[PDB]
């Protein structure tokens, strides 16, 4: 569920996938953070144990809200 995002990420390099599924390739964490920032989105570590770790560009708050919404609705 919970993913670490943005500056919480410690990986030197990550494989980057953008908000639409475009495979941006291997990028330094710094460049990945720049791309996320220019798009006003978050850099989310979706696959911490992949080699190299996989990050997805997305709005973390919107993603998390929808996930919690889904869980709650299906149980009431
Ligand atoms: C990967 Pb830079 C500090 C424009
Ligand atoms: Cl640079
Ligand atoms: Cl943000």
Curated annotation (Swiss-Prot):
Transmembrane segments: none
UniProt subcellular location: Cytoplasm
Quaternary structure (record): Monomer.
Assigned protein family: Belongs to the IF-3 family.
The protein's role, per its UniProt record: IF-3 binds to the 30S ribosomal subunit and shifts the equilibrium between 70S ribosomes and their 50S and 30S subunits in favor of the free subunits, thus enhancing the availability of 30S subunits on which protein synthesis initiation begins.
Record's protein name: Translation initiation factor IF-3
Source organism of this protein record: Geobacillus stearothermophilus
Source taxonomy: Bacteria, Bacillati, Bacillota, Bacilli, Bacillales
Residues of the full protein shown: 3 to 78 of 172
